[PDB]
Design a protein around this ligand. Structure first.
Ligand SMILES: CN1/C(=C/C=C/c2cc[n+](CCCS(=O)(=O)O)c3ccccc23)C(C)(C)c2ccccc21
Ligand SMILES: [Cl-]
Ligand SMILES: [Cl-]
Lengths: 111, 111
């Protein structure tokens, strides 16, 4: 099972400010760079955030990443319909000595 | 600005599981009692969780609090209409020597 903890499903309506969370521990999120990627069903992932809080080229400005201790978050400032996708976080883990991942949060955009 | 980090909002439909997050630091959430309260517009707030994970008397079974590392969460297992409210976390902060708060997560329950 995924080492990082992400809620499997989060919903919002257009324009809502929704932040999704990536809960880790001292050996991973707290000590290492976190990355986030977006994956539409059946599609190649797009890295949104690298090095905790840096936004990749080719990403809408409504996305931002941050960290708070053992937790990382991806904030969507104004949900849009095209944001319906699966969002994954990952980092190195010092204890496992390898990559660790969340299970992904599927964002649903409702009317 | 709030010292603890919460999603500004989230939506869900009746019966859906929703988790409210509250991320902090090693000097607040990690080592101090976290409390959660529920606020309805123009209504007396209710403290739902005290001491990280203890449910106040009368609080419905569907609410549960927990924390790990520097992040806390309140899980609502199966939204009801009456759960449409603003959920806040708070704790002591031993670095600031004062109370700290999340910004609140407004939960909207849709049809
Ligand atoms: C370690 N790791 C990864 C690192 C990804 C790094 C970067 C991803 C995207 N951009 C942005 C490039 C476009 S632009 O913004 O620079 O124009 C970067 C820019 C500078 C340095 C690193 C990156 C990914 C691939 C996430 C990954 C996946 C699975 C396991 C491990 C693992
Ligand atoms: Cl989340
Ligand atoms: Cl939240």
């Amino acid at each position: 099972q995924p080492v990082l903890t992400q809620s499997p499903s989060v919903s919002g309506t257009p324009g809502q400010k929704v932040t999704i969370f990536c809960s880790g521990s001292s050996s991973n999120v707290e000590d290492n760079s976190v990355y986030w990627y977006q994956q539409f069903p059946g599609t190649t992932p797009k890295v949104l955030i690298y090095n905790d809080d840096r936004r990749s080229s080719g990403v809408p400005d409504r996305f931002s990443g941050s960290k708070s201790g053992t937790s990382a978050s991806l904030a969507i400032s104004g949900l849009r319909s095209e944001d319906e996708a699966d969002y994954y976080c990952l980092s190195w883990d010092d204890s496992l000595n390898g990559w660790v991942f969340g299970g992904g949060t599927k964002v649903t955009v409702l009317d």
